[PDB]
Amino acid sequence: RIDPYTKKIEENTTKQKDLTEIKTKLLSFQTAVSSLADATVFAKRKVVGSI
């Protein structure tokens, strides 16, 4: 009577674990992209010449 309930519970839990993992990965990637999307960050200047 109650085995299918357990099985579906385990299925959903596994699905949720996997979704959480891929969510963390997607968030890290979005962090990277949002950090390095503004090209204006490359305002650095370097001093060279005949020194």
Measured distance CA(33)–CA(24) in Å, rounded: 14
Measured distance CA(37)–CA(35) in Å, rounded: 6
Measured distance CA(16)–CA(13) in Å, rounded: 5
The token pair that represents 14 in the structure block: 């596994």
Sequence-distant (≥ 6) Cβ neighbours of residue 10 within 8 angstroms: none
CA distances from 5 to 2, 11, 14, 43, 44 (A): 5, 10, 14, 59, 60
- In angstroms, what is the resolution? 4.7
- Measured in residues, the chain has a length of 51
The token pair that represents 26 in the structure block: 């997607």
| Sign, Cα dihedral of 26, 29, 35, 38 | negative
CA distances from 40 to 1, 16, 36, 37, 44 (A): 63, 39, 9, 9, 9
Measured distance CA(2)–CA(9) in Å, rounded: 11
